Design a protein around this ligand. Structure first.
Ligand SMILES: [Cu+]
Ligand SMILES: [Cu+]
Length: 138
């Protein structure tokens, strides 16, 4: 059962990985649909990281401590877009399934709004990537 603290500790680098892949995609992606996604992942998940880091400080009197994606496998992948989606889909799935779990445990209104946002946007992005993968590679 996830608590507010351990969730943020895990979700922070998880979001950071997505941002890092999305930044790489601004350079290496071919399909414009993918770059529009990346620009959204960057904007929306940097904002959530910033909030998680803030809340963590406010609630736990210290910054988020530190110590799932393979960015070198993506960098040297023969087909960037295919490997982006192949990694970003299950990555988003962990986010969704976790956000749903914490949703029924947390008592903080900040986390409850955050869970809904994750569940909402990331599920939608999954639907887009599934569709793109079918059109480009199906
Ligand atoms: Cu994340
Ligand atoms: Cu993701």
């Amino acid at each position: 059962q996830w608590t507010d603290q351990s969730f943020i500790e895990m979700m922070t680098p998880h979001h950071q990985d997505a941002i890092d892949m999305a930044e790489m995609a601004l350079q290496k992606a071919e399909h414009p649909e993918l770059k529009k996604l990346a620009r959204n992942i960057i904007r929306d998940q940097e904002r959530e990281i910033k909030e998680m880091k803030t809340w963590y400080q406010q609630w736990f009197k210290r910054p988020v401590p530190a110590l799932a994606m393979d960015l070198d496998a993506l960098a040297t992948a023969q087909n960037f877009d295919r490997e982006f989606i192949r990694q970003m889909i299950p990555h988003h799935q962990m986010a969704v399934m976790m956000a749903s779990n914490l949703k029924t445990n947390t008592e903080r209104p900040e986390m409850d709004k955050l869970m809904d946002d994750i569940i909402r946007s990331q599920s939608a992005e999954i639907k887009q990537m599934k569709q793109w993968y079918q059109n480009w590679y199906g």
